Design a binder for this molecule. Structure first.
Ligand SMILES: *C[C@@](C)(O)C(=O)N(c1ccc(C(C)(C)C)cc1)[C@@H](C(=O)NC1CCCCC1)c1cccnc1
Ligand SMILES: *C[C@@](C)(O)C(=O)N(c1ccc(C(C)(C)C)cc1)[C@@H](C(=O)NC1CCCCC1)c1cccnc1
Lengths: 305, 305
């Protein structure tokens, strides 16, 4: 019983983190087989952070300008390239601790674990979600660039995020591991604003199902509703619209609790119109939207890796 | 910027988890050097879960009845003992992946990371606190016994908790690694109730300091107060009383924000008397008490391991 913001075990990623230095900037790289991956802005200097031409800045750099350390060790760069917004440094030694892995580009509403690193050393692990506006509400300090986000499927690590920057609003932006940013953000010191951040409806429903499984029943009601009529209420409160694919993704939880999806939508509707009245659900006093339906089943059914 | 429930990287503990079977019960053990540690109730059977005599049950068991697996491997038990409520199984192979470690018995209000395991395989990692009534509000399913809680200090793992059981109220109880329970709980299927669960005041203050560091300023007020007068308000709302040691532990955060401890107490007092008025602090709609002063500085100053 119980329900917590649970991250994946980080062991397999810990072994992959290295420190990357170009001139005087030091950030984190990801060492997989014989390639090190890091944000390309490692090659920036102070004055061209406003509008750097990375291609131009790269002509003035050779293999030996990039210093890669894995712990106290030193690795030899024998090649370098730029793929969108990440650098790929080819090194002489394949990581002995490379796990089975793949690169995935996740969708908004999806969640992942973040291993926050500084100087190539892991500091902590937490869960977060890709928000509908393609930011993440992370916990990152100066130096955290190149930290990565991942999901684990048994023995296989799926890398989905590499941290690049903080926006002046305090939320965070980054790329997939092919270096394409999530959202419309660029790796420059310009005015970049996030759009409207709406609530991930299918995740809130999943979280109500978890509450039910754990015995928290007070919000369930007599009412039912329709997809169209719920989405009317969703739009006034800035909730993502619910589709039949979302209804289908909720099937497993519906089956376990005996509660149909549309009856749970009816319960959410009342909580949006009348609030929670100083009550709490699963220890929280607001509707939580960073647990996916899969996050819920894994926590309340015990999937291992 | 940002603030999340952050756990320690779990790599060093992952390598220590093994599967322990006695007859037909399978739970998790902790393999450190040539000893495996697990809850002694692994030797229970169905009918004597009401009141087992562990000493008696142990006379009918020899080394070869205990099966220990580390992954697909099998380890040889060459000795066994009972220390309070844990079994120590002596095996023929020292764990090659033993980290530097120590056993610590933590105090209420202190926090740690939990690696939830099933069948000796890690499932997820999260943070929790030892509550003032010596329970923990964890996330554990059947099979999770023997999962451990730990803090990390650079390279050294401090083990503080081993999970033993769930109470019928849904919270969790366990031992230190010397097998002495936290609280008055016993490893039997009897009516065991937790006492009053009060709020950890020094942790709430620490969390207000984190909010300030992250720019969340709206709760700060003109008032100040006194230790005695704050504790009057604390007792009506079931908050732990604040001592001068607690004031001193908050010194670093006070120094960083320029805000004296007693002025922050004045702000907490108003939030207890008038509530938060539908506002939120650090994304939460209630006062969070599972971050210690050290948790805060580590997150908002970047300690690595
Ligand atoms: C990458 C690193 C380690 O230097 C860093 O911490 N940060 C960063 C990221 C990108 C850049 C440029 C502008 C693309 C070169 C510089 C610095 C900071 C960060 O993003 N600061 C931003 C704040 C205002 C807008 C411009 C830069 C960082 C700080 C906290 C969390 N993540 C990243
Ligand atoms: C240990 C294990 C893996 O069998 C288990 O999951 N649980 C458990 C713990 C202790 C016991 C005895 C009674 C001491 C032998 C039995 C089973 C359960 C658990 O604690 N169930 C309790 C619920 C009602 C009171 C008696 C037992 C468990 C379940 C969920 C989370 N943690 C532990």
């Amino acid at each position: 019983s119980g329900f917590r913001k649970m991250a994946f075990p980080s062991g397999k990623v810990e072994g992959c983190m290295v420190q990357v230095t170009c001139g005087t900037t030091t950030l984190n790289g990801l060492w997989l087989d014989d390639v090190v991956y890091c944000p390309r802005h490692v090659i920036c200097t102070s004055e061209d952070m406003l509008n750097p031409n990375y291609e131009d800045l790269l002509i003035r750099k050779s293999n030996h300008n990039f210093l890669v350390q894995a712990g106290n060790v030193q690795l030899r760069v024998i090649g370098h390239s730029m793929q969108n917004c990440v650098l790929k440094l080819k090194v002489d030694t394949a990581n002995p601790k490379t796990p089975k892995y793949k690169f995935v580009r996740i969708q908004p509403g999806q969640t992942f674990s973040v291993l926050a690193c500084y100087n190539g050393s892991p500091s902590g692990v937490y869960q977060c979600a890709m928000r509908p506006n393609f930011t993440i509400k992370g916990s990152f300090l100066n130096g955290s660039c190149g930290s990565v986000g991942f999901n684990i499927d048994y023995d296989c690590v799926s890398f989905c995020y590499m941290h690049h920057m903080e926006l002046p609003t305090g939320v965070h932006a980054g790329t997939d591991l092919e270096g394409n940013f999530y959202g419309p953000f660029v790796d420059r010191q310009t005015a970049q604003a996030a759009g409207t951040d709406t609530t991930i409806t299918v995740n809130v429903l999943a979280w109500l199902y978890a509450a039910v499984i754990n015995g928290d029943r007070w919000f369930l009601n007599r009412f039912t509703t329709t997809l169209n009529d719920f989405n009317l209420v969703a739009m006034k409160y800035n909730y993502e619209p619910l589709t039949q694919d979302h209804v289908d993704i909720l099937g497993p939880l519906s089956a376990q609790t005996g509660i149909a999806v549309l009856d749970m939508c009816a319960s959410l509707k009342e909580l949006l119109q009348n609030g929670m009245n100083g009550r709490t659900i699963l220890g929280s006093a607001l509707l939580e939207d960073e647990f996916t339906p899969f996050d819920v089943v894994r926590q309340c059914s015990g999937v291992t890796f």
